[PDB]
């Protein structure tokens, strides 16, 4: 009765989107083909799985996921693997070639063929389900497939559905390292056409997760089985107060009123406190008033920026596990007496918590140990404003003399959007400067 | 108590009825050696409709199987079901008809009806109370359209009270398999309207669609398009053969559907069609069946129903069911698409309910319907005819076997005035 719908577009989202459904199937009892073990029965009262699963007539539980990419290489990677039995075989829509970093492809030439069919699945599930609460898209700003094609899927729901908030998650195009050359050209393109049709758009930087693995963990040289398993924890705890009952539970419709002050400041961060292996948490103690302070460490953020140069605007400390709600107000006023953690003056309170009665869990084979508690803090800060100063600076130096523009103009694109979008990310920076500028 | 006399002709018919007579063997638990080995007891209740009794508990059908050549009923005996069909019920000729009408209607199929009518009139008076008839036959060939239309003609001359039904294999309008289709199919539908009450038109172009896009088989035979035709045959009589919530017989849908003596050309269907590989992802419930059979891509003749207005629409159901939920679904398909019915009848939909679903299903339904967009099944044949009558394209075959051109000229004045009744109401 509290369902949400998920789509996964592009390789950087469908392969995290692989790792989303390891974790979800293990929170409940579903064996990975979709059948219950049936040695253990469950009583008929609970309706927990309906956020993400829809059980069929007989005994099989079926997810809410539309794994679409215009390539076969990553969908048939799943369609022949060990998770093939879970999904609907008509959900697995594929195509002919990648967008290949061409917004002139993923939105104009090749992306417009399957777009009349991929909306027919988002129309199908939401026809059957009634109490729909939001969308969980999984994309990336970088390439022309995960950012060119998701903007087509972003504006067709706004004309059709409307009032439902649309909670996508993404990989930020980094400051330091990258694996393309047309990414500064490309990330400005999704901003112009989605900003009038989006109500939430999160972000993660991927090379901070490289360096969390070196300090909090002891992982040197991390693969992408490891980073996508830290993304899975955060999404499963944002989406845990809809499928589990707790003390302080929030529907997805308060996540837009209380977290979006102005109609152009809706891009907040995320972090997760106890990423500790077994050789250290056997030595540490982990109480409540000392996992909350670790959430404000610069060594624990999932995005490399400077929280010490960012005045915190609206934290929302989601907890899990064996926690008791005196300890948070012991912890919160301990945080707000600290001198370094600067907040926003004209916001009077700027705090929110959520306490639930379900613990954190670990998919087996990973590094993580059994932690009794878990904090998943969504930090709406000022600190990410100067990370827009670099990517616009990364855009215009090839746009001094128009490099790689002649590949876009082949597939039905004009130059004119590139100039019209650069002031649009210059109109976005002037509002993040004024909010930290106090009203005297 | 209400048996069914079955007729067959041609080689087009006798591949279909060979597939019709095995789902009856499936649902009544009949093994291919003549006995019965089904685990129920309701399957043995009204066994008499299709299974006459003999010694040893043997159950052998009321079957008639006819052709003008021996080359086809050799294979029917050589199928998987050889011991069940009666050896005295293989009436045979020697010379094939060869895509011509008077080879079966006036000369070689005409001398042989006196041995078929011996078989029927002996057999049909062994029934304690027959309900009526049924035929699956070729309009495309020379034996079904040639000889079998005499058996529709002469048996109706004997008993005018019973009901004539036809699982007509009408030709496709796009891709044709014989150059004399606008004669054997044109002349056969000259005698269908004075003689036959239920007419189910079936196209293979309409059925090459369904076993690809819906059942998802890349290599379809006839024997896997024959079974969907053999699905809808036993999918008609679901309520006479078994108990349930609302039983209906083959006079009960020949009254609810055909308001006129000449507007009786039906349009068949079948409800629950989904792939073989993805069978266990759907939920086989009441909204799944109705959402398929009210569409154009679940239709067994090759005419789009959207170009006209249905006069009357029948149905039937099977399986344990909640009758209010169908009643919500039948008004919605009369309230939403009200432009796809005529406004001069109050009620257009009939339903009827069995109790036991088929072996392997839970919810079953079958779609039978009158529609005035069956004109495009007949205007294409009626415009093929006059494009070759005016060039006299094959008339030397027909004149040299005992016909005229006045038996040709009046066979489109029927076919024009048939469409000149359907046109006004749509």
């Amino acid at each position: 009765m509290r369902e949400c719908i998920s789509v996964h577009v592009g390789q950087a989202g469908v392969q995290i989107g692989n790792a989303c459904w390891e974790l979800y199937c293990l929170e409940h009892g579903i064996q990975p083909d979709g059948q219950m073990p049936s040695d253990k029965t469950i009583g008929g009262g609970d309706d927990s799985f309906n956020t993400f699963f829809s059980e069929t007539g007989a005994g099989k539980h079926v997810p809410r996921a539309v794994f679409v990419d215009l390539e076969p290489t990553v969908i048939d990677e799943v369609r022949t693997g060990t998770y093939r039995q879970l999904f609907h075989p008509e959900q697995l829509i594929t195509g002919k070639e990648d967008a290949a970093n061409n917004y002139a492809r993923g939105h104009y030439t090749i992306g417009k063929e399957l777009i009349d069919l991929v909306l027919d699945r988002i129309r199908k599930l939401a026809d059957q389900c009634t109490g729909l609460q939001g969308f969980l898209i999984f994309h990336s700003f970088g390439g022309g497939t995960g950012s060119g094609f998701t903007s087509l899927l972003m504006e067709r729901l706004s004309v059709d559905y409307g009032k439902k908030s649309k909670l996508e998650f993404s990989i930020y195009p980094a400051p330091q390292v990258s694996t393309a050359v047309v990414e500064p050209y490309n990330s400005i393109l999704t901003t112009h056409t989605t900003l009038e049709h989006s109500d939430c758009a999160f972000m993660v930087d991927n090379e901070a997760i490289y360096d969390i693995c070196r300090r909090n963990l002891d992982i040197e040289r991390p693969t992408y089985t490891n980073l996508n398993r830290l993304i899975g924890q955060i999404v499963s705890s944002i989406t845990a107060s809809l499928r589990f009952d707790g003390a302080l539970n929030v529907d997805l419709t308060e996540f837009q009123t209380n977290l979006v002050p102005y109609p152009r400041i809706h891009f907040p961060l995320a972090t997760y406190a106890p990423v500790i292996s077994a050789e250290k948490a056997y030595h540490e103690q982990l109480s409540v008033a000392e996992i909350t302070n670790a959430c404000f460490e610069p060594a624990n953020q999932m995005v490399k920026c400077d929280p010490r140069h960012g005045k915190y605007m609206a934290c929302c400390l989601l907890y899990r596990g064996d926690v008791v709600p005196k300890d948070v107000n012991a912890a919160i006023a301990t945080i707000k007496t600290k001198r370094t953690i600067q907040f926003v003056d004209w916001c009077p309170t700027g705090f929110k918590v959520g306490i639930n009665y379900q613990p954190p869990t670990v998919v087996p084979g990973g590094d993580l140990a059994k932690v009794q508690r878990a904090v998943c803090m969504l930090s709406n800060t000022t600190a990410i404003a100067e990370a827009w100063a670099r990517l616009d600076h990364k855009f215009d130096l090839m746009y001094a003399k128009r490099a790689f523009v002649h590949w876009y103009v082949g597939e039905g694109m004009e130059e004119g959007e590139f100039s019209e979008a650069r002031e649009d990310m210059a109109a976005l920076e002037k509002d993040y400067e004024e909010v930290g500028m106090d009203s005297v | 108590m209400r048996e069914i006399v079955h007729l067959q002709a041609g080689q087009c018919g006798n591949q279909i009825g060979a597939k019709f007579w095995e789902v009856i063997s499936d649902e009544h638990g009949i093994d291919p050696t003549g006995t019965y080995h089904g685990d129920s007891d309701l399957q043995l209740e009204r066994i008499n409709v299709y299974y006459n009794e003999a010694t040893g508990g043997k159950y052998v059908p009321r079957a008639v199987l006819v052709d003008l050549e021996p080359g086809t009923m050799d294979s029917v005996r050589s199928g998987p079901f050889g011991q069940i069909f009666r050896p005295d019920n293989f009436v045979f000729g020697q010379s094939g008809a060869g895509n011509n009408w008077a080879k079966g209607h006036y000369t070689e199929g005409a001398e042989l009806v006196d041995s078929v009518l011996d078989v029927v009139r002996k057999e049909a008076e062994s029934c304690d109370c027959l309900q009526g008839f049924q035929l699956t036959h070729s309009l495309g060939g020379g034996t079904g359209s040639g000889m079998g239309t005499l058996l529709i003609s002469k048996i109706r001359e004997e008993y005018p009270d019973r009901i004539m039904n036809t699982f007509s294999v009408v030709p496709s309008p796009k891709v044709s398999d014989t150059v004399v289709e606008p004669y054997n199919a044109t002349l056969s539908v000259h005698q269908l309207v004075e003689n036959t009450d239920e007419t189910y038109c079936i196209d293979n172009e309409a059925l090459y669609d369904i076993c690809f896009r819906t059942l998802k088989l890349t290599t379809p035979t006839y024997g896997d398009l024959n079974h969907l035709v053999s699905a809808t045959m036993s999918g008609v009589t679901t309520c006479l053969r078994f108990p349930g919530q609302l039983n209906a017989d083959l006079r009960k849908l020949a009254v609810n559907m055909v308001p006129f003596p000449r507007l009786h050309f039906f349009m068949p269907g079948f409800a629950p069609l989904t792939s073989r590989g993805s069978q266990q992802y759907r939920a086989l419930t009441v909204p799944e069946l109705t959402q398929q059979m009210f569409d154009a891509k679940n239709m067994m003749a090759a005419c789009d129903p959207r170009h006209g207005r249905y006069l009357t629409v029948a149905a039937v159901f099977r399986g344990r069911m909640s009758m209010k939920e169908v009643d919500e679904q039948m008004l919605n398909v009369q309230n939403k698409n009200s432009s796809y019915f005529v406004e001069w009848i109050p009620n257009n939909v009939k339903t009827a309910v069995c109790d036991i679903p088929p072996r392997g299903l839970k919810m079953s339904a079958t779609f039978i319907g009158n529609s005035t967009a069956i004109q495009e099944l007949f205007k294409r044949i009626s415009e093929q005819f006059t494009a070759m009558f005016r060039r006299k394209a094959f008339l030397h075959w027909y004149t040299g076997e005992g016909m005229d051109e006045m038996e040709f000229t009046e066979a489109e004045s029927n076919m024009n005035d048939l469409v000149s009744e359907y046109q006004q109401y749509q």
Partner: peptide
């Protein structure tokens, strides 16, 4: 995984 793979 050609045409009609699954």
């Amino acid at each position: 995984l050609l045409y009609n793979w699954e």
